[model samples]
Target: SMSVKKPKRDDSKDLALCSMILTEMETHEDAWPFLLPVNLKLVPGYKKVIKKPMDFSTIREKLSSGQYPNLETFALDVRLVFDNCETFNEDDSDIGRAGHNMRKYFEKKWTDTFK
Candidate 1:
């Protein structure tokens, strides 16, 4: 008996590109803060301040759910990660800096791949 599974290719160009960009960002060295949701236990005040919290992992879930109709369409959530970061952290702070780095990295990938 032999059972093998290969790559996943459910959606077309838009979905594929979204996956590609997100995969790259998740593995990036500066992905730590944005990898997962903010720990409410650690920063219990976070949710009260930032109404919309977003992270790379959340976007990954959305991609898997096929919620994004187009690459740019769900980029709203992609951009949300950085926006919320800036709202909560200072520009020179570790997580703040990392957020900026990841955003710049993601935008470059988006432009290069689609433009």
Candidate 2:
């Protein structure tokens, strides 16, 4: 419903909101598993967590051996984030709120990150 009539307009607000959503997610321990794999691949530098970049052999072995626990708790954490995102305000659309919240969030995170 909030489509722009023309191009070249900014979606900085939209970007901000995404950060907020992510921060909200990061605050929860249960979101760790889901974010870990993603952050490992995408967060600029995670292979640095170890001495070698392709050195996931040990970690992979641990995962296969069931030593890296935390599956059920992660699911519960995901459910909580979903619930928080969906338990909307009576006066606002959840999607809109999320967008706006994310925009505001982005503004802050961007400012902080850049500074």
Candidate 3:
């Protein structure tokens, strides 16, 4: 088994980021409020998208609409984050896993008739 550090009080920032994204999505609102002055450009491929606001808007529109276009694509989005939750903040606990888990949870929650 691999050892992982559990989340800590300092990990609230990551939680907040996760919460803000989910709340906005579930409630059908924009994530601008939580999208603070942070340089996510360091994340791979993020820089390509970071410089393009219109592209982000297009994606936001599609995601916010929840139409998803397809289930596999949607699941991939959920798993992508879930699989990489550790890189975002290094909190390896369950709540920390919420970044990815919540994605799957809510996707299923809203995907009832999405087939």
Compare candidates 1 and 2 on lDDT and give the better one. 1
Q: TM-scores, in order shown?
A: 0.85, 0.25, 0.35
Better of 2 and 3 by lDDT: 3
**Candidate 1 local accuracy as lDDT?**
0.86
Q: Model 3: residues >4 Å from true position, as ranges? A: 1-25, 28-38, 41-59, 63-69, 93-97, 107-115
Error of 2 at 42 (Å): 19
Question: Lowest summed lDDT over 10 consecutive residues: which window, candidate 3?
Answer: 29-38
lDDT of each: 0.86, 0.40, 0.44
Which prediction has more favorable TM-score, 2 or 3? 3
Cα deviation of 100, candidate 1, in Å? 1.0
| 42-101 per-residue lDDT for model 1 (tens digits) | 896797999988898889998999777766667889999999999999998999899899
Clashes of each: 0, 4, 1
**Alpha carbon lDDT at 39, candidate 2:** 38
**Top-TM-score candidate index:** 1
